Design a protein around this ligand. Structure first.
Ligand SMILES: Cc1ncc([N+](=O)[O-])n1CCOC(=O)N[C@@H](Nc1ncccn1)C(Cl)(Cl)Cl
Length: 313
């Protein structure tokens, strides 16, 4: 008896959230803490206590936060900046550990693979940071000519997927191979910015991507064969995608005109539900530790938490 609430369970106010499609401003940690980048500050919200901590604020004018990403075990937070910095923060003692520089432009995307932090920049380059050592910059992946707005390591760490405003999807190897730091695959089918990038948690080599306003499609790939398994028209820009193993489904966030979230059944790609409420385009989606709740951040300066994947007794 699958009951999906058509409304959110809770709404958080996100004043001054930056309405920039290419930034990745929210992330839900394994310890149940949402990190939210509001203009030039990062706020942490405990989903357990409802408590808020202002972790940091930029000190120079013009500066703003361009990305946030939790480390796997949820005690450290990576923060990308418009000044091309990748900062590492210890949230427990509430102090900055590192201010890693190496990029030439704002860092809009982040993704952890254990002790390796990968960062995407407006410049088009991707950097691997070994956050444990002095010379953190240990690699450079260059396969985009525009901003890297999507960046995601596979759960098993065997691939890194990147999506850009140059309409390309690149699948990179976990380490340099017979070709060095060159993509294993490059997909060109999308005709718009690819910010949505998510790996299937129960299928190692399966990747889902989503295109922007001029594409409007969700595409499923097998990154070994390099085949497109499916191309579904969503009739709206696709900003993020998340998988749920609870019922084996996908959820995507969208913009004009409905600004809705859509739940799809996998692998049929049948439309299961539409979640309406946001009054401006959705920007990002993040998932709670237990997988039951999805947080959607939108240009309407709210964060809507949807209990859409709960396993009811
Ligand atoms: C310091 C503070 N306490 C509540 C709010 N506020 O404006 O709501 N502020 C301003 C900073 O902004 C947020 O802290 N936004 C938060 N939203 C929120 N909304 C209602 C209840 C608790 N938190 C998150 Cl998005 Cl969770 Cl970080």
């Amino acid at each position: 008896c699958r009951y999906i609430p058509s409304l959110p369970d809770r709404i958080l106010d996100a004043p001054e959230i930056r309405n920039d499609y290419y930034l990745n401003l929210v992330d839900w940690s394994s310890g149940n803490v949402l990190a939210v980048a509001l203009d030039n500050s990062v706020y942490l919200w405990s989903a357990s206590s409802g408590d808020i901590l202002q972790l940091l604020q930029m000190e120079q004018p013009g500066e703003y936060i361009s990305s946030v990403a939790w480390i796997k075990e949820g005690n450290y937070l990576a923060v990308g900046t418009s000044s091309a910095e990748v900062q590492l923060w210890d949230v427990q003692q509430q102090k900055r550990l590192r201010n890693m520089t190496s990029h030439s432009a704002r860092v809009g995307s982040l993704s952890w693979n254990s002790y390796i932090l990968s960062s995407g920049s407006r410049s088009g380059h991707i950097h691997h940071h070994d956050v444990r050592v002095a010379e953190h910059h240990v690699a450079t992946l260059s396969g985009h000519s525009q901003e890297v707005c999507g960046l995601r390591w596979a759960p098993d760490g065997r691939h890194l997927a990147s999506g850009g405003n140059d309409n390309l999807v690149n699948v990179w190897p976990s380490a340099p191979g017979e070709g060095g730091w060159v993509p294993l695959q490059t997909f060109t089918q999308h005709q718009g910015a690819v910010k949505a990038v998510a790996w299937c948690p129960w299928q190692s080599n399966v990747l889902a991507t989503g295109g922007g306003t001029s594409d409007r499609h969700i595409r499923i790939w097998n990154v070994c064969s390099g085949a497109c398994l499916s191309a579904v028209d969503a009739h709206s820009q696709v900003c993020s995608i998340l998988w749920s193993p609870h019922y084996k489904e996908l959820i995507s966030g969208h913009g004009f005109a409905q600004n809705q979230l859509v739940i799809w059944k996998y692998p049929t790609m049948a439309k299961v539900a539409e979640l309406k409420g946001h009054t401006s385009r959705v920007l990002s989606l993040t998932m709670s530790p237990d997988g039951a709740t999805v947080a959607s951040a939108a240009a309407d300066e709210t964060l809507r938490l949807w209990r859409c994947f709960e396993l009811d007794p």
